Design an enzyme around this catalytic site. Sequence first.
Site, PDB file in Angstrom:
ATOM      1  N   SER A 171      -0.220  -9.877   2.836  1.00  0.00           N
ATOM      2  CA  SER A 171      -1.152 -10.294   3.887  1.00  0.00           C
ATOM      3  C   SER A 171      -0.441 -11.217   4.861  1.00  0.00           C
ATOM      4  O   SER A 171       0.488 -11.933   4.482  1.00  0.00           O
ATOM      5  CB  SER A 171      -2.368 -11.032   3.316  1.00  0.00           C
ATOM      6  N   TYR A 201      -5.105 -17.473  -2.307  1.00  0.00           N
ATOM      7  CA  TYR A 201      -4.634 -16.258  -1.660  1.00  0.00           C
ATOM      8  C   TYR A 201      -3.275 -16.471  -1.021  1.00  0.00           C
ATOM      9  O   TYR A 201      -2.339 -15.683  -1.232  1.00  0.00           O
ATOM     10  CB  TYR A 201      -5.645 -15.828  -0.622  1.00  0.00           C
TER      11      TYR A 201
HETATM   12  N1  LIG Z   1      -8.979  -6.615   4.568  1.00  0.00           N
HETATM   13  C1  LIG Z   1      -7.822  -6.309   5.172  1.00  0.00           C
HETATM   14  O1  LIG Z   1      -7.767  -5.620   6.238  1.00  0.00           O
HETATM   15  C2  LIG Z   1      -6.543  -6.820   4.547  1.00  0.00           C
HETATM   16  C3  LIG Z   1      -5.657  -7.594   5.294  1.00  0.00           C
HETATM   17  C4  LIG Z   1      -4.480  -8.038   4.726  1.00  0.00           C
HETATM   18  C5  LIG Z   1      -4.193  -7.704   3.422  1.00  0.00           C
HETATM   19  N2  LIG Z   1      -5.058  -6.957   2.706  1.00  0.00           N
HETATM   20  C6  LIG Z   1      -4.618  -6.566   1.267  1.00  0.00           C
HETATM   21  O2  LIG Z   1      -4.725  -5.172   1.142  1.00  0.00           O
HETATM   22  C7  LIG Z   1      -5.082  -4.809  -0.211  1.00  0.00           C
HETATM   23  C8  LIG Z   1      -6.274  -3.880  -0.197  1.00  0.00           C
HETATM   24  O3  LIG Z   1      -7.507  -4.634  -0.161  1.00  0.00           O
HETATM   25  P1  LIG Z   1      -8.761  -4.239   0.756  1.00  0.00           P
HETATM   26  O4  LIG Z   1      -8.716  -5.029   2.005  1.00  0.00           O
HETATM   27  O5  LIG Z   1      -8.919  -2.768   0.856  1.00  0.00           O
HETATM   28  O6  LIG Z   1      -9.923  -4.876  -0.142  1.00  0.00           O
HETATM   29  P2  LIG Z   1     -10.947  -4.313  -1.217  1.00  0.00           P
HETATM   30  O7  LIG Z   1     -11.865  -3.302  -0.605  1.00  0.00           O
HETATM   31  O8  LIG Z   1     -11.674  -5.516  -1.899  1.00  0.00           O
HETATM   32  O9  LIG Z   1     -10.020  -3.564  -2.289  1.00  0.00           O
HETATM   33  C9  LIG Z   1      -9.248  -4.242  -3.293  1.00  0.00           C
HETATM   34  C10 LIG Z   1      -9.063  -3.245  -4.402  1.00  0.00           C
HETATM   35  O10 LIG Z   1      -8.370  -3.886  -5.495  1.00  0.00           O
HETATM   36  C11 LIG Z   1      -9.026  -3.541  -6.697  1.00  0.00           C
HETATM   37  N3  LIG Z   1      -8.739  -4.558  -7.675  1.00  0.00           N
HETATM   38  C12 LIG Z   1      -9.002  -5.905  -7.629  1.00  0.00           C
HETATM   39  N4  LIG Z   1      -8.700  -6.565  -8.718  1.00  0.00           N
HETATM   40  C13 LIG Z   1      -8.183  -5.563  -9.556  1.00  0.00           C
HETATM   41  C14 LIG Z   1      -7.633  -5.616 -10.851  1.00  0.00           C
HETATM   42  N5  LIG Z   1      -7.810  -6.634 -11.690  1.00  0.00           N
HETATM   43  N6  LIG Z   1      -7.053  -4.486 -11.321  1.00  0.00           N
HETATM   44  C15 LIG Z   1      -7.115  -3.373 -10.586  1.00  0.00           C
HETATM   45  N7  LIG Z   1      -7.684  -3.191  -9.392  1.00  0.00           N
HETATM   46  C16 LIG Z   1      -8.190  -4.350  -8.920  1.00  0.00           C
HETATM   47  C17 LIG Z   1     -10.498  -3.441  -6.324  1.00  0.00           C
HETATM   48  O11 LIG Z   1     -11.218  -2.715  -7.347  1.00  0.00           O
HETATM   49  P3  LIG Z   1     -12.827  -2.797  -7.581  1.00  0.00           P
HETATM   50  O12 LIG Z   1     -13.546  -1.913  -6.493  1.00  0.00           O
HETATM   51  O13 LIG Z   1     -13.052  -2.160  -9.043  1.00  0.00           O
HETATM   52  O14 LIG Z   1     -13.320  -4.211  -7.361  1.00  0.00           O
HETATM   53  C18 LIG Z   1     -10.376  -2.691  -4.992  1.00  0.00           C
HETATM   54  O15 LIG Z   1     -10.333  -1.266  -5.107  1.00  0.00           O
HETATM   55  C19 LIG Z   1      -5.241  -6.122  -0.994  1.00  0.00           C
HETATM   56  O16 LIG Z   1      -4.111  -6.362  -1.838  1.00  0.00           O
HETATM   57  C20 LIG Z   1      -5.434  -7.175   0.113  1.00  0.00           C
HETATM   58  O17 LIG Z   1      -4.985  -8.458  -0.326  1.00  0.00           O
HETATM   59  C21 LIG Z   1      -6.216  -6.520   3.234  1.00  0.00           C
END
Ligand SMILES: NC(=O)c1ccc[n+]([C@@H]2O[C@H](COP(=O)([O-])OP(=O)(O)OC[C@H]3O[C@@H](n4cnc5c(N)ncnc54)[C@H](OP(=O)(O)O)[C@@H]3O)[C@@H](O)[C@H]2O)c1
Length: 294
Positions: free
Chosen positions: A178, A234
Amino acid sequence: ATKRYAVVTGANKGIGFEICKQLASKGITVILASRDEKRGIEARERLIKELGSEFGDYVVSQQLDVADPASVAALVDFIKTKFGSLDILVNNAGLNGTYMEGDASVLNDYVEAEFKTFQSGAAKTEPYHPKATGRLVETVEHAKECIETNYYGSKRVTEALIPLLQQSDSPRIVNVSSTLSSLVFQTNEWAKGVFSSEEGLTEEKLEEVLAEFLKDFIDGKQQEKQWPPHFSAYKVSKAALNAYTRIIAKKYPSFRINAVCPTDAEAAEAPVKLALLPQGGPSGCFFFRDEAFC
Ligand SMILES: NC(=O)c1ccc[n+]([C@@H]2O[C@H](COP(=O)([O-])OP(=O)(O)OC[C@H]3O[C@@H](n4cnc5c(N)ncnc54)[C@H](OP(=O)(O)O)[C@@H]3O)[C@@H](O)[C@H]2O)c1
Protein backbone atom coordinates in the site's frame (compact mmCIF):
# COMPACT_ATOMS: atom_id res chain seq x y z
CA ALA A 1 2.62 -20.94 -24.12
CA THR A 2 4.09 -23.10 -21.32
CA LYS A 3 1.40 -24.01 -18.76
CA ARG A 4 1.65 -21.99 -15.52
CA TYR A 5 -0.04 -22.34 -12.12
CA ALA A 6 -0.70 -19.44 -9.74
CA VAL A 7 -1.98 -18.97 -6.21
CA VAL A 8 -3.82 -15.76 -5.37
CA THR A 9 -4.60 -15.30 -1.69
CA GLY A 10 -7.61 -13.33 -0.44
CA ALA A 11 -9.08 -13.74 -3.92
CA ASN A 12 -12.88 -14.11 -3.36
CA LYS A 13 -13.49 -10.34 -3.74
CA GLY A 14 -11.83 -7.02 -4.39
CA ILE A 15 -8.55 -6.77 -6.29
CA GLY A 16 -7.62 -10.42 -5.64
CA PHE A 17 -10.73 -11.54 -7.56
CA GLU A 18 -9.69 -9.32 -10.50
CA ILE A 19 -6.08 -10.61 -10.39
CA CYS A 20 -7.48 -14.17 -10.64
CA LYS A 21 -9.75 -13.20 -13.51
CA GLN A 22 -6.95 -11.61 -15.47
CA LEU A 23 -4.46 -14.47 -14.92
CA ALA A 24 -7.08 -17.03 -15.90
CA SER A 25 -7.89 -15.09 -19.07
CA LYS A 26 -4.21 -15.32 -20.10
CA GLY A 27 -4.15 -19.13 -19.88
CA ILE A 28 -2.74 -19.31 -16.35
CA THR A 29 -4.33 -21.97 -14.13
CA VAL A 30 -5.25 -20.13 -10.95
CA ILE A 31 -5.98 -21.28 -7.42
CA LEU A 32 -8.58 -18.90 -6.02
CA ALA A 33 -7.82 -18.94 -2.26
CA SER A 34 -10.38 -17.55 0.22
CA ARG A 35 -10.59 -17.51 3.98
CA ASP A 36 -14.13 -18.93 3.76
CA GLU A 37 -14.55 -22.01 1.55
CA LYS A 38 -18.11 -21.20 0.40
CA ARG A 39 -17.36 -17.63 -0.71
CA GLY A 40 -14.45 -18.89 -2.79
CA ILE A 41 -16.61 -21.51 -4.45
CA GLU A 42 -19.14 -18.79 -5.19
CA ALA A 43 -16.46 -16.40 -6.49
CA ARG A 44 -15.18 -19.10 -8.83
CA GLU A 45 -18.68 -19.58 -10.28
CA ARG A 46 -19.01 -15.87 -11.05
CA LEU A 47 -15.51 -15.83 -12.48
CA ILE A 48 -16.36 -18.78 -14.75
CA LYS A 49 -19.70 -17.23 -15.78
CA GLU A 50 -17.94 -14.00 -16.80
CA LEU A 51 -15.01 -15.57 -18.67
CA GLY A 52 -16.92 -18.47 -20.24
CA SER A 53 -17.34 -22.14 -19.35
CA GLU A 54 -14.21 -23.02 -21.35
CA PHE A 55 -12.22 -21.53 -18.43
CA GLY A 56 -13.75 -23.93 -15.92
CA ASP A 57 -10.51 -25.98 -15.73
CA TYR A 58 -8.31 -22.86 -15.35
CA VAL A 59 -9.86 -21.72 -12.01
CA VAL A 60 -9.85 -23.81 -8.82
CA SER A 61 -11.17 -22.80 -5.40
CA GLN A 62 -9.23 -23.69 -2.24
CA GLN A 63 -9.85 -22.58 1.36
CA LEU A 64 -6.90 -20.63 2.80
CA ASP A 65 -6.49 -18.71 6.03
CA VAL A 66 -2.95 -17.25 5.94
CA ALA A 67 -2.99 -16.91 9.76
CA ASP A 68 -3.62 -20.68 10.25
CA PRO A 69 -0.57 -22.95 9.68
CA ALA A 70 -2.82 -25.98 9.15
CA SER A 71 -4.73 -24.11 6.41
CA VAL A 72 -1.41 -23.23 4.73
CA ALA A 73 -0.16 -26.83 5.03
CA ALA A 74 -3.39 -28.15 3.50
CA LEU A 75 -2.94 -25.79 0.54
CA VAL A 76 0.62 -26.98 -0.10
CA ASP A 77 -0.71 -30.56 -0.08
CA PHE A 78 -3.52 -29.64 -2.46
CA ILE A 79 -1.15 -28.01 -4.96
CA LYS A 80 1.28 -30.91 -4.66
CA THR A 81 -1.27 -33.62 -5.44
CA LYS A 82 -3.35 -31.76 -7.99
CA PHE A 83 -0.69 -29.98 -10.13
CA GLY A 84 2.78 -30.87 -8.83
CA SER A 85 4.13 -27.41 -9.64
CA LEU A 86 3.70 -23.72 -8.83
CA ASP A 87 5.01 -20.70 -10.77
CA ILE A 88 3.24 -17.58 -9.33
CA LEU A 89 2.31 -16.55 -5.78
CA VAL A 90 0.22 -13.37 -5.34
CA ASN A 91 0.09 -12.38 -1.66
CA ASN A 92 -3.03 -10.29 -1.70
CA ALA A 93 -4.73 -11.26 1.57
CA GLY A 94 -4.70 -8.22 3.85
CA LEU A 95 -6.27 -6.24 6.69
CA ASN A 96 -6.44 -2.54 7.55
CA GLY A 97 -6.48 -2.86 11.35
CA THR A 98 -9.25 -0.23 11.47
CA TYR A 99 -12.97 0.27 11.29
CA MET A 100 -15.38 3.22 11.32
CA GLU A 101 -17.69 4.18 14.15
CA GLY A 102 -20.59 6.28 12.90
CA ASP A 103 -20.71 7.72 9.37
CA ALA A 104 -18.43 5.38 7.37
CA SER A 105 -17.77 8.10 4.80
CA VAL A 106 -15.60 10.14 7.23
CA LEU A 107 -12.97 7.53 6.24
CA ASN A 108 -12.36 9.60 3.09
CA ASP A 109 -11.38 12.52 5.37
CA TYR A 110 -8.89 10.33 7.18
CA VAL A 111 -7.45 8.99 3.91
CA GLU A 112 -7.21 12.54 2.54
CA ALA A 113 -5.19 13.77 5.54
CA GLU A 114 -2.72 10.93 5.08
CA PHE A 115 -2.27 11.59 1.35
CA LYS A 116 -1.31 15.24 1.81
CA THR A 117 1.86 13.95 3.51
CA PHE A 118 3.05 12.97 0.02
CA GLN A 119 2.71 16.54 -1.17
CA SER A 120 4.38 17.96 1.98
CA GLY A 121 6.52 15.30 3.68
CA ALA A 122 5.32 16.73 7.00
CA ALA A 123 4.42 13.51 8.84
CA LYS A 124 1.97 14.45 11.62
CA THR A 125 2.57 12.54 14.87
CA GLU A 126 -0.51 13.88 16.81
CA PRO A 127 -3.89 12.22 16.30
CA TYR A 128 -6.30 14.32 14.28
CA HIS A 129 -9.92 13.18 13.87
CA PRO A 130 -11.50 15.31 11.12
CA LYS A 131 -15.13 15.05 12.29
CA ALA A 132 -17.35 13.97 15.15
CA THR A 133 -19.70 12.43 12.54
CA GLY A 134 -17.37 9.38 12.43
CA ARG A 135 -14.23 8.00 14.06
CA LEU A 136 -11.49 5.68 12.77
CA VAL A 137 -11.23 3.06 15.52
CA GLU A 138 -7.98 1.11 15.92
CA THR A 139 -8.27 -1.53 18.67
CA VAL A 140 -5.36 -3.48 20.12
CA GLU A 141 -6.75 -6.83 18.91
CA HIS A 142 -7.21 -5.50 15.33
CA ALA A 143 -3.61 -4.21 15.44
CA LYS A 144 -2.44 -7.75 16.36
CA GLU A 145 -4.57 -9.37 13.64
CA CYS A 146 -3.35 -6.82 11.11
CA ILE A 147 0.36 -7.58 11.82
CA GLU A 148 -0.37 -11.33 12.04
CA THR A 149 -2.07 -11.36 8.62
CA ASN A 150 -0.16 -8.76 6.58
CA TYR A 151 3.37 -9.62 7.76
CA TYR A 152 3.35 -13.14 9.29
CA GLY A 153 0.50 -14.39 7.08
CA SER A 154 2.21 -13.36 3.85
CA LYS A 155 5.56 -14.67 5.11
CA ARG A 156 3.99 -17.98 6.25
CA VAL A 157 2.40 -18.60 2.84
CA THR A 158 5.59 -17.58 1.01
CA GLU A 159 7.90 -19.92 2.90
CA ALA A 160 5.46 -22.86 2.54
CA LEU A 161 5.33 -22.41 -1.25
CA ILE A 162 8.94 -21.45 -1.98
CA PRO A 163 10.02 -25.15 -2.18
CA LEU A 164 7.39 -25.67 -4.85
CA LEU A 165 8.06 -22.31 -6.61
CA GLN A 166 11.79 -23.00 -6.74
CA GLN A 167 11.16 -25.88 -9.18
CA SER A 168 9.78 -23.34 -11.66
CA ASP A 169 11.99 -22.07 -14.49
CA SER A 170 10.51 -18.59 -13.78
CA PRO A 171 9.16 -18.34 -10.21
CA ARG A 172 7.16 -15.15 -9.49
CA ILE A 173 6.13 -13.70 -6.13
CA VAL A 174 4.04 -10.50 -5.93
CA ASN A 175 3.32 -8.86 -2.56
CA VAL A 176 0.32 -6.53 -2.58
CA SER A 177 1.41 -3.56 -0.41
CA SER A 178 0.00 0.00 0.00
CA THR A 179 1.06 3.62 -0.43
CA LEU A 180 0.77 3.85 3.39
CA SER A 181 3.84 1.59 3.40
CA SER A 182 5.96 4.58 2.39
CA LEU A 183 8.50 5.62 5.00
CA VAL A 184 7.26 9.25 4.82
CA PHE A 185 4.55 7.98 7.21
CA GLN A 186 6.92 6.20 9.61
CA THR A 187 6.99 8.74 12.42
CA ASN A 188 9.13 6.49 14.65
CA GLU A 189 12.76 7.25 13.87
CA TRP A 190 14.19 3.94 15.13
CA ALA A 191 11.68 1.91 13.08
CA LYS A 192 12.23 4.11 10.01
CA GLY A 193 15.97 3.48 10.32
CA VAL A 194 15.43 -0.28 10.33
CA PHE A 195 13.07 -0.20 7.31
CA SER A 196 15.54 2.05 5.39
CA SER A 197 18.55 -0.23 5.81
CA GLU A 198 19.97 -1.55 2.57
CA GLU A 199 22.73 -3.45 4.39
CA GLY A 200 22.43 -5.61 7.48
CA LEU A 201 18.64 -5.78 7.29
CA THR A 202 17.44 -9.06 8.82
CA GLU A 203 14.04 -10.63 9.38
CA GLU A 204 15.06 -10.63 13.03
CA LYS A 205 15.28 -6.82 13.03
CA LEU A 206 11.91 -6.54 11.26
CA GLU A 207 10.29 -8.78 13.82
CA GLU A 208 11.82 -6.68 16.60
CA VAL A 209 10.23 -3.55 15.17
CA LEU A 210 6.88 -5.34 14.96
CA ALA A 211 7.07 -6.62 18.53
CA GLU A 212 8.13 -3.18 19.75
CA PHE A 213 5.21 -1.53 17.98
CA LEU A 214 2.76 -4.06 19.43
CA LYS A 215 4.15 -3.60 22.93
CA ASP A 216 3.81 0.18 22.81
CA PHE A 217 0.36 -0.17 21.22
CA ILE A 218 -0.85 -2.43 24.05
CA ASP A 219 0.88 -0.17 26.60
CA GLY A 220 -1.07 2.76 25.14
CA LYS A 221 2.06 4.79 24.32
CA GLN A 222 1.49 5.07 20.54
CA GLN A 223 1.97 8.81 20.56
CA GLU A 224 4.55 8.85 23.36
CA LYS A 225 6.80 6.56 21.29
CA GLN A 226 6.21 8.56 18.03
CA TRP A 227 4.26 5.81 16.22
CA PRO A 228 1.87 6.94 13.43
CA PRO A 229 -1.38 8.31 14.86
CA HIS A 230 -3.67 6.75 12.19
CA PHE A 231 -3.58 3.49 10.19
CA SER A 232 -0.79 2.68 12.57
CA ALA A 233 -0.62 -1.15 12.44
CA TYR A 234 -1.30 -1.00 8.70
CA LYS A 235 1.63 1.31 8.04
CA VAL A 236 4.12 -0.67 10.14
CA SER A 237 2.96 -4.05 8.80
CA LYS A 238 3.06 -3.07 5.10
CA ALA A 239 6.44 -1.36 5.50
CA ALA A 240 7.72 -4.55 7.17
CA LEU A 241 6.31 -6.55 4.24
CA ASN A 242 8.19 -4.30 1.77
CA ALA A 243 11.45 -4.75 3.68
CA TYR A 244 10.77 -8.50 3.86
CA THR A 245 10.22 -8.52 0.08
CA ARG A 246 13.72 -7.13 -0.43
CA ILE A 247 15.23 -9.67 2.00
CA ILE A 248 13.87 -12.70 0.10
CA ALA A 249 14.53 -10.97 -3.25
CA LYS A 250 18.25 -11.25 -2.34
CA LYS A 251 17.87 -14.80 -0.90
CA TYR A 252 16.38 -16.17 -4.16
CA PRO A 253 18.02 -14.38 -7.14
CA SER A 254 16.55 -16.81 -9.66
CA PHE A 255 13.05 -15.58 -8.58
CA ARG A 256 11.37 -12.27 -9.43
CA ILE A 257 9.95 -11.03 -6.09
CA ASN A 258 8.27 -7.60 -5.91
CA ALA A 259 5.83 -5.44 -3.91
CA VAL A 260 3.23 -3.28 -5.63
CA CYS A 261 0.80 -0.56 -4.53
CA PRO A 262 -2.40 -1.23 -6.52
CA THR A 263 -11.91 0.36 -10.00
CA ASP A 264 -10.63 -3.11 -9.05
CA ALA A 265 -10.04 -4.30 -12.59
CA GLU A 266 -7.66 -1.40 -13.22
CA ALA A 267 -5.88 -1.77 -9.88
CA ALA A 268 -5.29 -5.49 -10.66
CA GLU A 269 -3.27 -4.64 -13.80
CA ALA A 270 -0.13 -3.77 -11.82
CA PRO A 271 0.13 -7.00 -9.76
CA VAL A 272 -0.88 -9.00 -12.85
CA LYS A 273 1.98 -7.49 -14.87
CA LEU A 274 4.40 -8.37 -12.07
CA ALA A 275 3.04 -11.95 -11.93
CA LEU A 276 3.86 -12.42 -15.65
CA LEU A 277 7.06 -10.37 -15.45
CA PRO A 278 9.75 -11.45 -18.01
CA GLN A 279 13.05 -13.01 -16.89
CA GLY A 280 14.76 -9.60 -16.92
CA GLY A 281 12.22 -7.82 -14.80
CA PRO A 282 13.46 -6.36 -11.54
CA SER A 283 13.36 -8.03 -8.14
CA GLY A 284 13.29 -6.45 -4.70
CA CYS A 285 11.38 -3.36 -5.80
CA PHE A 286 8.28 -1.60 -4.49
CA PHE A 287 6.25 -0.45 -7.51
CA PHE A 288 3.59 2.23 -7.47
CA ARG A 289 0.89 1.12 -9.94
CA ASP A 290 2.87 0.83 -13.23
CA GLU A 291 6.13 2.69 -12.39
CA ALA A 292 9.61 1.40 -11.46
CA PHE A 293 11.58 2.09 -8.28
CA CYS A 294 14.10 -0.46 -6.83
N1 LIG B 1 -8.57 -0.64 -1.18
C1 LIG B 1 -7.59 -0.42 -2.06
O1 LIG B 1 -7.80 0.08 -3.21
C2 LIG B 1 -6.18 -0.79 -1.66
C3 LIG B 1 -5.16 0.16 -1.70
C4 LIG B 1 -3.87 -0.19 -1.35
C5 LIG B 1 -3.61 -1.49 -0.97
N2 LIG B 1 -4.60 -2.40 -0.93
C6 LIG B 1 -4.19 -3.86 -0.57
O2 LIG B 1 -4.68 -4.71 -1.57
C7 LIG B 1 -5.03 -6.00 -1.01
C8 LIG B 1 -6.43 -6.37 -1.44
O3 LIG B 1 -7.41 -5.80 -0.53
P1 LIG B 1 -8.78 -5.13 -1.01
O4 LIG B 1 -8.60 -3.66 -1.09
O5 LIG B 1 -9.35 -5.83 -2.18
O6 LIG B 1 -9.65 -5.41 0.30
P2 LIG B 1 -10.72 -6.50 0.72
O7 LIG B 1 -11.92 -6.45 -0.16
O8 LIG B 1 -11.04 -6.34 2.25
O9 LIG B 1 -9.97 -7.90 0.48
C9 LIG B 1 -8.98 -8.44 1.36
C10 LIG B 1 -9.01 -9.93 1.13
O10 LIG B 1 -8.09 -10.56 2.06
C11 LIG B 1 -8.74 -11.68 2.62
N3 LIG B 1 -8.11 -11.97 3.89
C12 LIG B 1 -7.99 -11.17 5.00
N4 LIG B 1 -7.45 -11.74 6.04
C13 LIG B 1 -7.18 -13.04 5.57
C14 LIG B 1 -6.55 -14.14 6.18
N5 LIG B 1 -6.38 -14.27 7.49
N6 LIG B 1 -6.28 -15.21 5.39
C15 LIG B 1 -6.70 -15.20 4.12
N7 LIG B 1 -7.37 -14.25 3.47
C16 LIG B 1 -7.56 -13.17 4.26
C17 LIG B 1 -10.20 -11.27 2.73
O11 LIG B 1 -11.03 -12.45 2.92
P3 LIG B 1 -12.53 -12.43 3.54
O12 LIG B 1 -13.54 -11.93 2.44
O13 LIG B 1 -12.83 -13.97 3.91
O14 LIG B 1 -12.62 -11.42 4.67
C18 LIG B 1 -10.38 -10.59 1.37
O15 LIG B 1 -10.73 -11.47 0.30
C19 LIG B 1 -4.76 -5.92 0.50
O16 LIG B 1 -3.56 -6.60 0.85
C20 LIG B 1 -4.73 -4.40 0.77
O17 LIG B 1 -3.91 -4.11 1.90
C21 LIG B 1 -5.86 -2.08 -1.26
